[PDB]
Design a protein around this nucleic acid. Structure first.
Ligand code: MG
Length: 904
RNA sequence: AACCCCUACCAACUGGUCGGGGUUUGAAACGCCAACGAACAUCAUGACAGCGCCC
RNA sequence: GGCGCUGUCAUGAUGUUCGUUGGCU
């Protein structure tokens, strides 16, 4: 919107006043407006924007801002006091969440608390995707008999001394006989699993660095890490781990688990410092021997500038200055000589970047001091600002280089000696105990994930905490003095956690598999590419593994895209998901056509493999390239190993894994959204119970998870005991509403008389639905149309199907059983279709008794036309009916995906 | 685009024309130039081990 | 010592998606 970027950020309500906010430094906020009655009382000296009363006091005609409307129309901001008192949450749960989170402090006559609470609510839902992926990764690697790190596996409240030997530590168990034997079985399983060579795929969590080769830690650390991951799983989905576990960590966990988290944080931070101080000892030795300056301060800027982010808004590429600087004849041996400079390329480039940055900073500081001494009107812009202005004025690529060459030349004229010397040849991180356990556990969670997921998670968490801290800073100035209850007391120091997460981002990267677990990785690699050898002979080839063998080792074990799918390891399966030549077209077609749509200017992704597989010639068309590589993705059997034609299968390994990676990640992301939906329905059921409504929470599993939708839909019509009374009440209320219509809205009553006699019959039929809508409990299910749709849906639900849907969504069965039913789909046009076809097939496998009628017809449809049925999905999203946006986004193809909106 | 709110005329009001607002809706609060950090793939570059061919 | 390609890493160059800073109307 134009008003938001125009200079207006938020419009808050406290008491009878209105508190606008214009932007401030970073994500913070500054108060600029005070609206009361019909008055204008802008506070700041410099008016960021001007607003005045609009017509009928229904808004503010914002104007005289930085930039105006492109087509010349008034921009009006809604008055929050127009309707009446403070607007309510669409779910109608403002008071209960305010009381739960802020206790009795929150008065309730404000509009800032429930904006802070929703950020915590989004923190609760973001971690679902990443814990789902992390738990699936460990689940796949061993412990596949029944489950590992599940809802009943590990408790992180049992000390390892009390876990290994329950007999000697029976004091805390109150002398129980079943639990001790169950935990003995669990300890047997853990001891068997800890020695598994398959455990090497994960990095610093389990196999730690000692010297040239990784060494497994003691069982204490691994047991603690598994227990903590199981504790995260327990906290998210609900026992000593309630809904407030991660928020209260130090006082809840035993000293041993906190010791393990401190050990991991110390490991990573100390590794960074020791590396960049004495293991990259050449860099520090150059840092000390650079100029006549204090070594400690120089190192303090060097480390803070290199690894962290401080380049900020200086406005130009330093690296291209250094490129022009290297282009000269004096330092040509940097490129000409490859014997010695190759191992110090990064050091040299970083040092040149640092010295340029430091020169610019020092000049800026000196010029700023001079200008502060001088009058403000006459300002010396200095060289960095004149350079920025020159770059801004230019509008040609080559002309930019014409402007840009001179700066490098003159700085070389100034920086001769240090560059000649380079060419010729105070701990900062926050301890290991001051950091909260939340940050360490987030790091441990990221340590199981992929490169992109880490960045997404930490970026979103940082943004949410910045929002929280800015709102907390705004709270006192607007007259709200609500405080934090002891249970939810973690959110007071949101800024500190934000800083810790920023540092984690500065060192949160992938761990990468070990080099000691190669023996099992050969087995999994040969399994993925269609092996068919007998398992006795296959284990024989495994033990003898360490002809085409050498190819497997050298060109397979270390494949970059191999470490992206093995983390989702399904050895026995996963070769039948890219086996039918009707789903490879879709993923390749989509990526090549849309994602790499700018391959017209060079070698694309599919273009490279097409060129190397067709015979290094031919340029027919994109579609012919999509339908030619699929026949090479399909039938990637190991059993074959005219030889040149067979070599294509070796030639196209790196795309196979990419296809499987896309498919699996899309499936798990969709499943994670469905898990988010069910977590939301559970928490909303609990909240509606706490508010004081009529609900049965114990029998929520038995009923088809439709308790919340049934309650929020309004009056009850499923019970056949008093249908006559309900019908009579609705009829009399509709009749009363129709009779007293002129006083309600005279304009409609004026036209009502001219209607025909039968149109009155339709009007009464619709007024019955109108009254049933009036008898509801929610804002979403208050308009008649969605209420009648949901009411029609509710009458046709089968509870066992819903229960199976929920159980298989939570248990992640689809990502573990996809191989069974994927070859019986004729056409695929969206990931939605594939996921849901798998869903109805898994529901197929069980429900074959006592389902005569609608569900029977729908499953008949899946078996025959081999395409997922939209109506079955619409009946299976009934548990999601109290939030209409979510109900649509999880049942309509067009509205599911934000990226996919152009075609629909 | 979905979903809720708002001015002006129409309008069963379960619907529309010129438009605005929404961190308190769903994974979801901001017109260009000029830069920063993460991941994706291609060209060129020296070094590594290898799948096969010639002297 | 060469012909064809694949796979790791470090330097460099170009295009896409998310999120950040300063300037312009
Ligand atoms: Mg929100």
């Amino acid at each position: 919107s134009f008003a938001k970027g125009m200079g207006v950020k938020s419009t808050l309500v406290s008491g009878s006043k209105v508190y606008m906010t214009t932007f401030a430094e970073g994500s913070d906020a500054r108060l600029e407006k005070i609206v009361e009655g019909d008055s204008i009382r802008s506070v700041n000296e410099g008016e960021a924007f001007s607003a005045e009363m609009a017509d009928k006091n229904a808004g503010y005609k914002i104007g005289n801002a930085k930039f105006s409307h492109p087509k010349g129309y008034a921009v009006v901001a809604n008055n929050p006091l127009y309707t009446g008192p403070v607007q309510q949450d669409m779910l109608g749960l403002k008071e209960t969440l305010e009381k739960r989170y802020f206790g009795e402090s929150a008065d309730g006559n404000d509009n800032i608390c429930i904006q802070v609470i929703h950020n915590i609510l989004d923190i609760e839902k973001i971690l679902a995707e990443y814990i789902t992926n992390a738990a699936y990764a460990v689940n796949n690697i061993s412990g596949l008999d029944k489950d590992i790190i599940g809802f009943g596996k590990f408790s992180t409240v049992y000390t390892y001394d009390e876990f290994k030997d329950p007999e000697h530590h029976r004091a805390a168990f109150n002398n129980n006989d079943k639990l001790i034997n169950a935990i003995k079985a669990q300890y047997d399983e853990f001891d068997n699993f800890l020695d598994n060579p398959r455990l090497g795929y994960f990095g610093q969590a389990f196999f730690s660095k000692e010297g040239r080769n990784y060494i497994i830690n003691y069982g204490n650390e691994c047991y603690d890490i598994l227990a903590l991951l199981s504790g995260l799983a327990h906290w998210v989905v609900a026992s000593r781990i309630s809904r407030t576990w991660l928020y209260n960590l130090d006082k809840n966990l035993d000293n041993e688990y906190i010791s393990t988290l401190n050990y991991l944080y110390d490991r990573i931070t100390n590794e960074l410092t020791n590396s960049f101080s004495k293991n990259s000892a050449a860099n520090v030795n150059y840092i000390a021997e650079t100029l006549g300056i204090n070594p400690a301060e120089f190192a303090e800027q060097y480390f803070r500038f290199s690894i962290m982010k401080e380049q900020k808004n200086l406005g130009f590429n330093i690296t291209k200055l250094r490129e022009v600087m290297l282009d000269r004849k004096d330092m040509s041996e940097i490129r000409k000589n490859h014997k010695v400079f190759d191992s110090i390329r990064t050091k040299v480039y970083t040092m040149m970047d640092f010295v340029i940055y430091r020169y610019y900073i020092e000049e800026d500081a000196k010029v700023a001091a001079a200008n502060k001494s001088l009058p403000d009107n006459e300002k010396s812009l200095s060289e960095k600002d004149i350079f920025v202005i020159n770059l801004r004025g230019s509008f040609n690529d080559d002309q930019k280089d014409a402007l840009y060459y001179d700066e490098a030349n003159r700085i070389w004229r100034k920086l001769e000696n240090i560059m000649h010397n380079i060419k010729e040849f105070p701990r900062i991180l926050p301890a290991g105990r001051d950091v909260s356990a939340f940050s360490k556990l987030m790091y441990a969670l990221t340590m199981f994930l992929d490169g992109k997921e880490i960045n997404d998670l930490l970026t979103t968490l940082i943004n949410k905490f910045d929002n929280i801290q800015s709102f907390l800073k705004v709270m006192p100035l607007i007259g709200v003095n609500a405080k934090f209850v002891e249970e939810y007391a973690f959110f007071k120091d949101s800024a500190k956690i934000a800083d810790e997460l920023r540092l984690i981002k500065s060192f949160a990267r992938m761990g990468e598999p070990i080099a000691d677990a190669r023996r099992a990785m050969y087995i999994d690699a040969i399994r993925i590419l269609g092996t068919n050898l007998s398992y006795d002979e296959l284990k024989a080839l495994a033990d003898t593994f360490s002809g085409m063998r050498n190819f497997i080792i050298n060109n397979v074990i270390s494949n970059k895209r191999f470490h992206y799918l093995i983390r989702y390891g399904d050895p026995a399966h996963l070769h039948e998901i890219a086996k039918n030549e009707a789903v490879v077209k879709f993923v390749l077609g989509r990526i090549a056509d849309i994602q790499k749509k700018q391959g017209q200017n060079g070698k694309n992704q599919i273009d490279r493999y097409y060129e190397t597989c067709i015979g290094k010639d031919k340029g027919k068309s994109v579609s012919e390239k999509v339908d030619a590589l699929t026949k090479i993705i399909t039938g990637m059997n190991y059993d074959q190993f005219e030889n040149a034609e067979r070599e294509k299968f070796k030639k196209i390994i790196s795309l196979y894994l990419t296809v499987i990676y896309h498919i699996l990640k899309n499936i798990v992301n969709i499943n994670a959204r469905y898990v988010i939906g069910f977590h939301c329905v559970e928490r909303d059921a609990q909240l509606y119970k706490e508010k004081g409504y009529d609900i049965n929470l114990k029998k929520l599993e038995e009923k088809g998870f439709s308790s919340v939708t049934k309650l929020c839909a309004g009056i009850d019509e499923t019970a056949p005991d008093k249908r006559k009374d309900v019908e009579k009440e609705m009829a009399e209320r509709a009749k009363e509403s129709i009779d007293s219509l002129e006083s309600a809205n005279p304009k409609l009553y004026a036209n009502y008389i001219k209607y025909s006699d039968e149109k009155k019959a339709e009007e009464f039929t619709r007024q019955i639905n109108r009254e049933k809508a009036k008898t509801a409990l929610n804002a979403y299910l208050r308009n008649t149309k969605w209420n009648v749709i949901i009411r029609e849906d509710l009458l046709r639900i089968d509870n066992k199907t819903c229960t199976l849907f929920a159980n298989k969504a939570v248990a992640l069965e689809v990502a573990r059983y996809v191989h069974a039913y994927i070859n019986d789909i004729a056409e695929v046009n969206s990931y939605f279709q594939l996921y849901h076809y798998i869903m109805q097939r898994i529901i197929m496998n069980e429900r074959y008794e006592k389902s005569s009628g609608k569900v029977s017809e729908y499953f008949d449809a899946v078996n025959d036309e081999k395409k997922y049925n939209d109506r079955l999905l619409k009946l299976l999203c009934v548990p999601f009916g109290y939030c209409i946006p979510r109900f649509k986004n999880l049942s309509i193809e067009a509205l599911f995906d934000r990226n996919e909106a152009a075609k629909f």
